[PDB]
Subunit: 384 residues, 2 copies
């Protein structure tokens, strides 16, 4: 039920002379459509001018409204107030300040329409945000973008954020629900759960994903825990963790909980115990082994760090962090032994395989990446 598929159905029904059906279709879809073709077909149908005014209600702010403005004065007046292709061929036909301004503007816009986005859409949004009637202009731009990229979850986040900043969060929630029905990824559901206060999304998405989707399920748990910490506080965060428990929660969920417990409370004991539990569940997880060791060494829990290192298998990075630590605040005697030990381990082919490595974006896409990076945890990322 995409823009193009409503369009093609409408055109078939027109061609069929099924006017009962066509009239219900427009009835249901016209107000909501930011597709000019279609409006224009509504015009073709009605023809078989108060109805160019009705269309201009929708497309007056549009950079390709010229033929529409042409066919339709103080009509000439507040087209001249819209940056559009061929505005100079409307001036010539039609106050000079106002036109000049709208022609200067279409210069900055033209290359973004040329090369139409999703990333130039973002660029367009940002340009218009900076510089009641402005709001009206901004609604058109976001909805037209929603039509153009109905499939891309970013567009729905852009408008939602715009709407939130103008105090229209109820309208934002509806845009997100719609985005969730029309695009595909986990992002918009995570943003819906957290920003629009809907805890049900976490359980519902768990049931939907149902091994193959292990990453989704761990990223849901982490994000669900975050929701609960934010909305309810630590004791209910703590209760949700303990309930999650008769399912295989991945290595990441333990590492995430240990880190919340450390940075929220300052306990060293509790994260040690969460990392330790997790290592019992995932005895072969190099991630947990490395992140546990480096966490203990970085917060300064030396004695525990050293005992853990002695018991575990090691990546080169764990070896190199421990060697560098010993050199800085340890002894040369022990430093020399840890070097001997690392060279022995390389030789025995005993070093665990390495973990993968790892103002970027600006404006409203910048904002999106801010949310995305935050929902993502370490190398556990949203994936499709």
């Amino acid at each position: 039920s995409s823009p193009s598929a409503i369009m093609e159905h409408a055109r078939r029904l027109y061609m069929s002379k099924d006017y009962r059906s066509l009239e219900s279709l427009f009835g249901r879809c016209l107000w909501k459509s930011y597709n000019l073709d279609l409006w224009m077909l509504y015009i073709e149908y009605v023809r078989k001018f108060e109805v160019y005014e009705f269309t201009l209600g929708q497309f007056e702010n549009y950079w390709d409204s010229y033929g529409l403005f042409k066919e339709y004065r103080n009509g000439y007046m507040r087209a001249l107030q819209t940056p559009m292709g061929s505005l100079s061929e409307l001036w010539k036909d039609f106050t000079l300040p106002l036109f000049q301004s709208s022609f200067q503007r279409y210069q900055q816009i033209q290359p973004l329409i040329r090369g139409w986005s999703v990333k130039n859409a973002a660029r367009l949004i940002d340009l218009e945000m900076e510089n009641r009637p402005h709001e009206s202009r901004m609604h058109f731009i976001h909805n037209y973008i929603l039509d153009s990229f109905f499939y891309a979850e970013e567009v729905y986040f852009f408008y939602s954020e715009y709407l939130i900043g103008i105090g229209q969060k109820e309208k934002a929630k509806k845009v997100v629900e719609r985005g969730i029905e029309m695009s595909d990824g986990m992002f918009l559901s995570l943003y819906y759960g957290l920003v629009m206060d809907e805890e049900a999304v976490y359980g519902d998405l768990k049931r939907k994903y149902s091994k193959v989707f292990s990453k989704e399920l761990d990223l849901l748990r982490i994000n669900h825990l975050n929701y609960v910490l934010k909305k309810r506080g630590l004791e209910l965060f703590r209760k949700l963790f303990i309930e999650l428990g008769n399912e295989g929660v991945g290595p990441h969920v333990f590492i995430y909980c240990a880190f919340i417990e450390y940075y929220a409370t300052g306990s060293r004991a509790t994260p040690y115990n969460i990392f330790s539990s997790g290592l019992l569940k995932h005895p072969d997880s190099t991630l947990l082994k490395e992140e546990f060791f480096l966490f203990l060494l970085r917060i300064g829990d030396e004695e525990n760090a050293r005992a853990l290192f002695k018991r575990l298998e090691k990546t080169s990075r764990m070896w190199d962090s421990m060697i560098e630590y010993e050199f800085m605040v340890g002894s040369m005697e022990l430093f020399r032994e840890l070097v001997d030990q690392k060279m022995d381990a390389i030789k025995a082919d005993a070093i665990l395989p390495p973990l993968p490595p790892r103002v970027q974006m600006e404006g409203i896409l910048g904002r999106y990446h801010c949310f995305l990076d935050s929902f993502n945890f370490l190398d556990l990322k949203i994936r499709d």
Copy 2:
């Protein structure tokens, strides 16, 4: 007095026909030399102007179980010759063949053919038995060389280091004393071949330390400091040979802010290991306008946090560094990330809010607020970051921050990485390495 200076000078004397100076050069340099070209020139000069076989014996004593001895043995056995007296000739050529065959070296099969031909000529019967009895020797040396051959063909510091590692494994189960002798030859050959490379003096020092020859090791290092042009061997020397004097000797060569700051960080470490935290701090204070660079503050803040657990003491040091160095992005970013990582939340936030910021400080603070803060504050931080990218108020990023080596070379890299601190790196300013174009 480098090997190459000596080879050049010797060729000069020889081509000039200044035969007096040349013979003097040979007298003072030969026995200390592991450069085969210099010894062959000596052979070539002795052939021209003069028991020649004795000069081959003198040369094969230096290049004992050398892997490119074939030309030496072949020419030597030609000289045995050319001995008046069958029995003594026979004796000598047999000992020559038998010494070669125990040596892993190129062209060993060609000496094997010559050897079998020689024994059979004397007696087809007793000779076949002599050869049969020597076959496993030859075969062992042939096999061993198959593993040496690609290291020599690809000769480099790294393959030199590999040859050291392979011979340290001791596959022939050499008794203590001839294994040591093997290793001394190998390391001295390497020192001569790469006389200018700090690595190889480290390789030899570490070998000698391990066999309880640490005074020998200190003189190896003293030679290397003279032959190389960086600050690796001097730091190694200070710390491993316990020689505090080297810190002031380096302070002269360099008074180069970055090198001065590396040298100060490493001197501070020497004092720490030797005399502990209290004398570490006295040295810090005295450095201590005298004036030192940001890295020295960051280094000392770390050593105090990790060594004593204090949060006040690192805070104060970072703070003092930032007052001496107000425009230091490295310091602002290092100080901020430190406070966030150890969980010093209120100091981290208060610091953040008064500093200029990299995108990484922004990103780390955004992430932290999302994780354990509030959503309205996350949103503001995100607002502020966008505003900051807009005003081009962002501080340009710190430089990005290698591969893993094994055996002896991997040991060199461990000592080097340890001496190095953050983006401060030792270098030899006279060597042109993989990225020389810069």
